[PDB]
Automatic annotation (TrEMBL):
This is Spermidine dehydrogenase, SpdH. Heme b binds at residues 21, 378, 476, 520. The keyword Flavoprotein applies. PROSITE patterns: TAT. It comes from Pseudomonas aeruginosa (strain ATCC 15692 / DSM 22644 / CIP 104116 / JCM 14847 / LMG 12228 / 1C / PRS 101 / PAO1). Transmembrane segments: none annotated. GO terms for molecular function: metal ion binding; nucleotide binding; oxidoreductase activity.
Amino acid sequence: YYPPALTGLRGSHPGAFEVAHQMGWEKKTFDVDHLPIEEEYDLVVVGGGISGLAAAWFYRERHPAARILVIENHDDFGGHAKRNEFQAGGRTILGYGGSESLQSPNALYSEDAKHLLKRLGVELKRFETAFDTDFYPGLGLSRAVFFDKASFGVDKLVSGDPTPMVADEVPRDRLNARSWRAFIGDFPLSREDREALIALYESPRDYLAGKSVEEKETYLAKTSYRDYLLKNVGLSETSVKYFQGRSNDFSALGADALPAADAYAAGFPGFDALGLPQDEPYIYHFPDGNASLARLMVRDLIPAVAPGRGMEDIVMARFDYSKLDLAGHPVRLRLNSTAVSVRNRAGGVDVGYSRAGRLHRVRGKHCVMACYNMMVPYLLRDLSEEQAHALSQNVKFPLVATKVLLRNWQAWKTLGIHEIYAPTLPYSRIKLDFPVDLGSYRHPRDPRQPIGVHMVYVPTTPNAGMDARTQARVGRSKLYAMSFEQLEKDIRDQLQAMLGPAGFDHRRDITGITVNRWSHGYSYFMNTLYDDEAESEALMELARSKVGNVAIANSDAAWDAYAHAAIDQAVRAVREL
Ligand SMILES: Cc1cc2nc3c(=O)[nH]c(=O)nc-3n(C[C@H](O)[C@H](O)[C@H](O)COP(=O)(O)OP(=O)(O)OC[C@H]3O[C@@H](n4cnc5c(N)ncnc54)[C@H](O)[C@@H]3O)c2cc1C
Ligand code: HEM
């Protein structure tokens, strides 16, 4: 039994969500009060993502003899941080199912997070050599933009994109990019539109002239990036389509739901002459993404699942899932199990869960809710109406992270590219995977040999007048109506249209597809186009309040969709108990 080698429809896979939806959609209740208590623990963690695993880890650190149960509803631990695997040419090729890398860790990681890393044997400086930073640039490859015929009249791939991004693994001087005039000069847009885009870079103007800096900042917080471009910069509706999907990957929303002020902070163009006031290499990437963080914690917590120690041997270590949930062992991780009930009683907490359609009741002195926060009201019976409602307002964003095994990457080499941005297509981000050597694992190097592609699909509804919560809920409705066959068609259609001109043939050249469907992906985050900062902060703090011996974690609890928020919220929750 070995989930990482599965391909096909993954992420929140069939079997992971149905009991949860019986609660959330049908309002079915699954009470276990009339069942005997089957097992007893010092701590029961609901949810086996990075946050829940960290909670078990910091709790044992404080209580070394503690008996800990971790209940997780997917068929594998890690939550968004999942290991994907392909077999190709007698070797393993690794991919990340979701949680991608550690974000600017020297700048952003707390002392507690850094302590977790060090105890697990993660040396951040090791990625300076593990990440092969000059591999694709040294091969003369650049990033490209793919314009689709539906939106721009013709399919066109334009390379040499100089656009700097938030979390960039390419040193700025190794972009193999062209000037703005030459690059935009190739856009399939009217001469007028191309000249206006070029001028956006060559000759910025104070599009808000006459406002104080403060009024500019007020206006930009209340105005979408798309509207800023349309109404103040004066770009045409055809021009701004170029920008529509740029924010999809890092914020799970298009330019219509991105506050102009957030676009400024993320390095988007148009602000240089506004008079507004005033980088870490994005290389902290295990070959299976932050799934390595989850695996490192699982192995540290449950030594029987795999041998070794440290960041090197984790990469190819063989996990034996039969050792995760062994009786009498102090730490047990129970997969395929949906918690349905959490109730304070007699100085402890009773937790009911459903596994293979059967209800169960266990008991712990302490409980950490490390699951999706909007799930918590359906489980935690003691919530006041106020706090349950607060939890329910963390409306997470759906995303789809697709891994594609290719027979070779000659087509990419021919086209001179290692990454594509598509302004309006379902997949806005498509790239050859990061080249990382770690432990015994070596990144694919030969374009005649197989390689993994990473591509992100976000089911936004651009330009419709929806607030962010509604685009998220509607995006999940669209994902719920998509079969795996429809998902694969979209992958194959777009890969063929982008790579076909250089000899790509999707039926011949794709040898693997793994679709990680994160219907409940990024935590909600406060959006100044729709939310008030003080109200939202009050909701956040209320939602995560301690309930008896039940503490609440998940990255959701910080309204902050980051692995280090997952850790910090677990630490706060463990300290509360
Ligand atoms: C596509 C994608 C890419 C990302 N990339 C990055 C990145 O590069 N860097 C970064 O820092 N962050 C990234 N993230 C953010 C990611 O959310 C965090 O990194 C981290 O994985 C979140 O951990 P968590 O424990 O808070 O939540 P999760 O990983 O979602 O874990 C919560 C778990 O609880 C489970 N659960 C829910 N209800 C129940 C129930 N009733 N019973 C039992 N279990 C239940 C859920 O199924 C889930 O498995 C990314 C997220 C996505 C979706
Ligand atoms: C294939 C995966 C999934 C799809 C397509 C999906 C889709 C949806 C949709 C369309 C909604 C209604 C809109 C909303 O309230 O956000 C929803 C809500 C909900 N989802 Fe899922 N979902 C999936 C997986 C999961 C998983 C893995 C969990 C938890 C373990 C979950 C728990 C919930 C809950 C509890 C609600 C109710 C939200 C509330 O009432 O606040 N879903 N989901």
